[PDB]
């Protein structure tokens, strides 16, 4: 039922990764909502269950496959399937708990983790912060294997958590931010793994706030500036949507768009 997008780390290139992220964005957004040239994800309110999720089937050079389920309202990875088992992060509410029963319905073994899937929780389980977890094609290749082997005892919990952190950033964050997509393209082009710098981390941390600031803006102008960081960790002040058009590819729905109000 739910749309499936396929990606493999096996011989991945800048182009194959670019095609993948473009396809993910295309399945996440409908085109009904574009504000200051930036697309908005579907509103959760009144969204039919048959339109709620997309599936990302990840394959690797090791000939293993896992399927991630993404919530279209926020691009969040809500769980995964590997063969005969599926695992879901602890739902935030009763609506989300019902929603995930519509995923991987023919799987033999269904589990809900007692932990949530946010970075804070995953970092504490990994024993490492995002700033110290290497990203790139190699890490993703390895993450796919780690997810695959969890049900059979091959993967320790910190490795599993680290693997989720890798997947979330290389898929969901890349979908949300052209800038983060670009950072992953660079890693793939040179086949060089590296942890995300402060520019990546601060964008990830600020996605909700940036989405709200843009949507609540007066003709694009922020009421309050948002502080981001450069690659070297120095401050970058954002006052306007204009500077973010090349940076952010999609926003979470936060408010109704104000009337056109042309002069």
Swiss-Prot record:
Annotated catalytic residues: 76, 119, 173, 176
Effect on the protein of changing residue 72 to A/M: No effect on the toxic activity or the vascular leak syndrome
Applied use: A deglycosylated form may be linked to monoclonal antibodies to produce immunotoxins exploited in cancer treatment. However, a point mutation should be introduced to eliminate vascular leak syndrome, a side effect resulting from endothelial damage.
Catalytic reaction annotation: Endohydrolysis of the N-glycosidic bond at one specific adenosine on the 28S rRNA
Annotated residues for binding of AMP: 76-77, 117-119
Domain of life: Eukaryota
Chain ranges passing through the membrane: none
Chain positions carrying an annotated carbohydrate: 6, 232
Binding site for a carbohydrate: 4-6, 11, 46, 137-142, 191-193
Stated consequence of mutating residue 93 to A: No effect on the toxic activity but Suppresses the vascular leak syndrome
Function: Acts as a glycosidase that removes a specific adenine residue from an exposed loop of the 28S rRNA (A4324 in mammals), leading to rRNA breakage. As this loop is involved in elongation factor binding, modified ribosomes are catalytically inactive and unable to support protein synthesis. Can inactivate a few thousand ribosomes per minute, faster than the cell can make new ones. Therefore a single molecule can kill an animal cell.
Record-given protein name: Ricin A chain
Parent-protein start and end of this portion: 40 to 302 of 576
